[PDB]
Ligand binder design. Sequence first.
Ligand SMILES: CC(=O)SCCNC(=O)CCNC(=O)[C@H](O)C(C)(C)COP(=O)(O)OP(=O)(O)OC[C@H]1O[C@@H](n2cnc3c(N)ncnc32)[C@H](O)[C@@H]1OP(=O)(O)O
Ligand SMILES: CC(=O)SCCNC(=O)CCNC(=O)[C@H](O)C(C)(C)COP(=O)(O)OP(=O)(O)OC[C@H]1O[C@@H](n2cnc3c(N)ncnc32)[C@H](O)[C@@H]1OP(=O)(O)O
Ligand SMILES: CC1=C(CCOP(=O)(O)OP(=O)(O)O)S/C(=C(/O)CCC(=O)O)N1Cc1cnc(C)nc1N
Ligand SMILES: CC1=C(CCOP(=O)(O)OP(=O)(O)O)S/C(=C(/O)CCC(=O)O)N1Cc1cnc(C)nc1N
Ligand SMILES: [Mg+2]
Ligand SMILES: [Mg+2]
Lengths: 847, 839
Amino acid sequence: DSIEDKNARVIELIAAYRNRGHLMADIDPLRLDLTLWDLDREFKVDVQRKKLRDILSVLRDAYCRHVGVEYTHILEPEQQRWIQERVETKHDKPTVAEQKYILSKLNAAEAFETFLQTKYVGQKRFSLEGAETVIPMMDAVIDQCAEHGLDEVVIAMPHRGRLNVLANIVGKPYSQIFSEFEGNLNPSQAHGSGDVKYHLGATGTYIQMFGDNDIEVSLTANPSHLEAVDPVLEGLVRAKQDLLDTGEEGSDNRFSVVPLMLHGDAAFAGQGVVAETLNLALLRGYRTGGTIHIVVNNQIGFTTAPTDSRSSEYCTDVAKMIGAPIFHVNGDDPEACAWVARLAVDFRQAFKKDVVIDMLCYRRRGHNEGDDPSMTQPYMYDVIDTKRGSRKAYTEALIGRGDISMKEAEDALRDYQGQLERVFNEVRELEKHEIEPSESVEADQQIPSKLATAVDKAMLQRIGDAHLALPEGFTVHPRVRPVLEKRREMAYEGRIDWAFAELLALGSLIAEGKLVRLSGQDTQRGTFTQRHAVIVDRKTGEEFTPLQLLATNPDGTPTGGKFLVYNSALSEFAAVGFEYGYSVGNPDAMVLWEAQFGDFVNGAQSIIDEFISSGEAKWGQLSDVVLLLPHGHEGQGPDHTSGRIERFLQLWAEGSMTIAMPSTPANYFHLLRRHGKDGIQRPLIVFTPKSMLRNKAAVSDIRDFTESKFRSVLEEPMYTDGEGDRNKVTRLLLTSGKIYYELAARKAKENREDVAIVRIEQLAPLPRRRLAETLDRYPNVKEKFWVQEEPANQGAWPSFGLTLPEILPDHFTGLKRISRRAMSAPSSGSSKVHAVEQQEILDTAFG
Amino acid sequence: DKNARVIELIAAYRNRGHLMADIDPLRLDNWDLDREFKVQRKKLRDILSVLRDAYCRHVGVEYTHILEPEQQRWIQERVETKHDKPTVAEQKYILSKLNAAEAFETFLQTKYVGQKRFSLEGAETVIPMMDAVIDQCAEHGLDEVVIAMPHRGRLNVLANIVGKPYSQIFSEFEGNLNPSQAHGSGDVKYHLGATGTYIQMFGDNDIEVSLTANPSHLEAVDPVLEGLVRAKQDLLDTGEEGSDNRFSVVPLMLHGDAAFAGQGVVAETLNLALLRGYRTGGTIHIVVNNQIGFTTAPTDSRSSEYCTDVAKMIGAPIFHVNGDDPEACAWVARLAVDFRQAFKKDVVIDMLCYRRRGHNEGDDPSMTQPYMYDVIDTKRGSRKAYTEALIGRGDISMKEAEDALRDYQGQLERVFNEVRELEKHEIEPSESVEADQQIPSKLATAVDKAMLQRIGDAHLALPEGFTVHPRVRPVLEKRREMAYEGRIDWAFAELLALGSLIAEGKLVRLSGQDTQRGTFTQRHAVIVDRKTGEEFTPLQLLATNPDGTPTGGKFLVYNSALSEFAAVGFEYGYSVGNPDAMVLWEAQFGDFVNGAQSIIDEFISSGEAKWGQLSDVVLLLPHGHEGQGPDHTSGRIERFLQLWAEGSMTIAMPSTPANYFHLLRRHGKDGIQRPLIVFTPKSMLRNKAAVSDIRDFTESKFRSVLEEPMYTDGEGDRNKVTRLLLTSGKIYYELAARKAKENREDVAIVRIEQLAPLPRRRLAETLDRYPNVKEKFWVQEEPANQGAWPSFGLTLPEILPDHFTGLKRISRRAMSAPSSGSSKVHAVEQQEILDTAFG
Ligand SMILES: CC(=O)SCCNC(=O)CCNC(=O)[C@H](O)C(C)(C)COP(=O)(O)OP(=O)(O)OC[C@H]1O[C@@H](n2cnc3c(N)ncnc32)[C@H](O)[C@@H]1OP(=O)(O)O
Ligand SMILES: CC(=O)SCCNC(=O)CCNC(=O)[C@H](O)C(C)(C)COP(=O)(O)OP(=O)(O)OC[C@H]1O[C@@H](n2cnc3c(N)ncnc32)[C@H](O)[C@@H]1OP(=O)(O)O
Ligand SMILES: CC1=C(CCOP(=O)(O)OP(=O)(O)O)S/C(=C(/O)CCC(=O)O)N1Cc1cnc(C)nc1N
Ligand SMILES: CC1=C(CCOP(=O)(O)OP(=O)(O)O)S/C(=C(/O)CCC(=O)O)N1Cc1cnc(C)nc1N
Ligand SMILES: [Mg+2]
Ligand SMILES: [Mg+2]
């Protein structure tokens, strides 16, 4: 009513457009879903005086045209002001040369799809038709990154316009893409079992069209499993940033390697790994200084409408949890798409935070190029039939503006189409090779000859002394202090436990110049209070990392090594994905991921199945990620007992991974040191102990570290070092893990000279030669038994019971099993029932 | 202008006031007032006092992210108004809950100091808060509250909220279990569930309270709870598939702060909240935010301000409440239920508290968090502070409070003594649960020809003016023809099985990614009008008898979200919630079921042995080597076979449509409340040889072992057979076509349709019909380390030594991936198998 009362209604209106203007924005290319006298009156705006008509025009233009902005949810006021200053101001129109360049990208995007439709009508390619604006948008992201002088852009994306992105953004040769469609692959392309064309990656150098800077562009490989690559990309980028000494663990806060993550609208809302990966964005051990997210929102998921794909307004609403700004942009406006892309990069650079671009578009054809979409979405495809497409609509705009002519536009398309045909002809002209079955990739990585993993006594002692080389005035917790003192004593006197042997292995590698990354749930202290990789000051809370002292030589010079130890988030899928990604990103790093209990690794099953166990065969992607899985039957229940050995053994083929269950601390030390020094970029699966960590018998001597190597097959010390007679042995018990000690204690108690226990430390690849050689030392053996704690359908028996009598018939024909009955669950819920079952196994083994 | 600054200030408190609220009980991180303004006309001092009281005291309110204006106004009206204090009787009742909560934890600390119980100490306010949720649900006249929660205060919740007898809880600590408690392999005490009846203290209403079982896997039970509640809602005819939109079954989901932010299944389950096939009319979420995750600080557990920030994606209101204020906690709990009832939407309560002891009762927390535990040691505890507050108010005396605690402590000791007095039973190893569910004798699954014809006729019984898509119409017409003339394909036999069950009165729930039409355009369970977009479900016509009476059955078919973990979890929960329902979940390709590994491992394969929880969930997994790549080839048969033990599940790979029909009808009629794993076909859906006759549906039953038709119906001689090829799946047709082409009378192909439990007797009986067999081979498309060979190669020579000693394998080499990436390489490998099998 009054001038003071009207001014309050203006501030409400300013806020309404800033908070809810995006709900009115003309973002959908398909289009499916105070008095008038006060307009010329001046009002106070945060302070300057502006007319209502000018305030309203700025608000409508910024928030209700082809760009929908979601940013008021952000808690940082400086971020809200930064977005406000760049969206609520008239941004200069692009140059004729820049416009022509955008059209050239839309031309290369559309013609690439139509060419494939004409030549390979029967083959699926997951076309970007109806979403061609992704190409000039990604180009603008990469160009803006190059303008900031960044080092690399790493891309992860699904199937949608993948071939297009590889050819028009990354720079993968058209000849290579057409050869995959032709089915005529050379020995390098036909190597391994392989994977489909829209899962493959590439690398290249992006050169600025209107700038002088250049930037590396990489696209990583991925399975069909939508969004599974999300933490893998993050891990890959983090490893690269750590090598470049940029980012969280670097000197320069540049975060010069940029993750560019693409997504589909149904997969972004539906896959849990998306929230798991976004939750890593600002963590100390996982941050990459912000990811640029592009959602190719074609408002469909195969035959599923968005109404059945999510419970939220936008497919991007999950990204609001990390305070990420969200930009919904109309896919029919390539200039707004290129502008939002450059704004996104600028925001990422200013606040080192994630930015999400929701590109509203459509899918011109069916889900695949063979699917009929009118069966399930007739109304949408009746609307698509009327739409002209971004390329033709943008061409008509540029001719209308007077930038180009109809002839210039037509000659440009014919030049690109001509170039494709010329390359297609040469691929067809290549002589067709004989199609042969896929071959095992086992021989691709050769075991090095005579590799030494032993360390000198001085090394053990230095790692020991490092545990007591505390900073001035540091107050050690009274229950942590005996561990540090016992470790220095262990390093000089012997009887080294499992927890110290692990740190002796990692510390000696750091001293040799290796980067060690160790992470997992409560991994800094350890689930079983054994590691103490990081010790906390009882009074101040200051952290001390003893192994970090080994990154410096005694003269003061750096070794080149580093110890990166973190407590992970309560995730398995994202954390395992990230560590796999890290190991691929930096192959010279020692990357270890620890499960709280091995029973939780099934939460990251997609990473194990789709990346860790099959990545080499499928894409030639090498990873040496170490998985530490606490395993053992101790009466703690079915979810605190098994790391599912049987599952990893089942997945094993073509010498893809090393699967071990060491029984001694020294053997574990040699296993870890071999993995970090052998140069075999293949994963390592370690079934680690819980109660065995504190077993007084499960200790090792200094000579085991300084004079021995890894031993895949272990005999009882009485036959190798003692006065035991191998000829008295009639019964042979073959085992793996902590049950050896329980069997050895029973053998000692009853003085059973007729029984020998042989341990298999390396489960896969099977040490066939060493195992045969070891059994040949017991000539009077009449019966052999595989003994294990695990149920009959679990542990090593499902694979060993079948492979051992086949690979060694003269040694294992008639091999019987001693174990728990076949069980649905990994063990019993009661510790008392476990104890009875355990005694039954020992009684049977000595019956 | 002054009035404009007031509007910005009003907005500042409503949007960001929660950042200033005194919600943390530990406190770790550190002239115009009399003028009137237009809001009605109110003084700035009165506006400011209302804003500070509503948004900056012990309750932090996040709601301005909500897009519905009516929801924002509803919260504003209940939050920005002076709320009446609870009555002396209500206050005394809240203290009685805090007394029960703390004394239960101190009693277990004193009696079983060495056993881990995951104490709720420092978070005792969860008990009066949950009581207020349940009491408010009972006040709304709701039928049931189903709870899912982790380990934190689980024993406490079972004893003080659900009503699990203390005698039972203490017998679990003593390790003295009777035959019913010791049945199966079992699970730890803080994973078990219970049921009971909640009776209002100051009301006359009663409500069912249930707590569901769960594994250690934090948050995995979230979609399971949703599915369980949804099945109960559908039975009560309340909700989305009901006459009334009451949603009378309430999901009460509890969480830990580190698990809520870190587990992806949380976002997957929240994404289901408003979907047609998954919505439960809103979940009440309680986060026990003790600002710790074992030894991990919140700074390393999440990238967001609040552990609850993920729930803002479905526009859920979030209430951060101080755990030291039990009255604010009880008020927020009742506000949450009221919001859920008004808008049938999810509500999140973030109870800020602390963990008095270590992660477990044996863990020393000062090793990793010395500052936090130096602060906790100075804190008095919600029970003692609340006791002192009521003494100060004059509600109770020091004597009345002490006498109340003595009564609860005295009752606990009395019960503990009786459990100790019980005779200790001999501890024996766990036993298989196989015999618990017996196969029924002579169960008929065949239907009359008229039923096949009715399901056929239903595909063409289109509504008036309905326009069928030109490529969908031949499927409907071919189906009516198939129903009367025979040559029934796979896709129609499935709908014949489901349709006949609906006609018999069974509730059929079928869901999965693009399941309504089918990934391979074969199902067409829902047909869309080409002109209007109107949907028509042919099988729904079978829920009505020809006289017009309902059969009692219903067809619930949905397109799922792009999830595996939550969708499989939900369907498992649904099958447990309604055991009389036919619940089927279909994977796009079986290669994506590993995204639900935790549900398969922790619920489907081991739920019966661990908790006595029975599920008859059906997993449909499209499987087969066709050259579509390593992620469009295998459902990982070897993994399901590995998990199989104690007759927990049925694992099948049928080769004929008729067999699949009988497998599905047997599952829905046999009464065995155990899951079914079906490896379903892709190209075999359109194979002209993979068809069945009417007689196989009307006069036959499921056949676990199948012979070639030439021996059972044709003119083939079994005695001429010298080589025997044992197989499963679509490769049979490729082997049969090779046998026919080369006229190999010396070779016979025997199919194993049911992989687990192994049909040992039928398999032996079938092989005894080929007496001149000199060599036997297991033939499969799958790599040597995959398919049925890893288990069959070991079990078959052991269970049947006179038949399978020296059984050799014919398959693809052992592979890291389920198959090759090239279709050309697949074709060469496939021909190599056929060539070896007939070499
Ligand atoms: C990660 C992988 O799986 S790549 C494995 C390579 N595979 C092949 O070469 C195919 C043939 N395979 C084989 O011969 C066996 O499975 C092998 C590799 C275990 C060797 O059999 P064995 O000789 O009986 O076991 P053994 O422990 O004595 O191996 C002997 C040597 O190979 C090394 N070695 C064995 N397995 C591995 C492994 N998984 N990673 C690294 N080095 C290994 C040992 O350290 C040892 O080196 P050394 O002779 O200087 O002491
Ligand atoms: C889901 C489960 O695992 S409950 C399994 C019960 N387990 C046991 O009884 C342990 C002993 N096991 C066995 O006898 C075998 O493993 C069985 C159950 C497969 C039967 O072996 P066979 O007789 O050789 O195969 P067959 O298919 O002819 O089974 C015969 C009968 O049992 C029924 N049957 C077999 N398996 C199942 C099953 N998984 N679910 C329901 N019914 C079944 C058959 O339909 C048939 O019924 P019918 O007598 O009316 O014709
Ligand atoms: C469900 C599914 C698809 C629906 C796609 O939904 P969107 O995310 O909206 O993507 P588009 O619209 O297709 O660009 S594609 C798809 C494919 O097989 C990808 C083609 C490939 O790469 O081989 N799957 C199957 C699928 C289901 N579940 C999971 C976890 N991953 C999947 N890939
Ligand atoms: C990581 C982990 C825990 C940390 C708990 O974090 P929060 O969510 O904040 O809970 P609390 O503070 O303990 O109430 S408890 C826990 C337990 O073993 C639960 C005790 C049990 O039920 O046996 N695990 C291990 C764990 C790791 N990953 C997954 C998916 N689930 C887990 N349970
Ligand atoms: Mg889509
Ligand atoms: Mg916690």
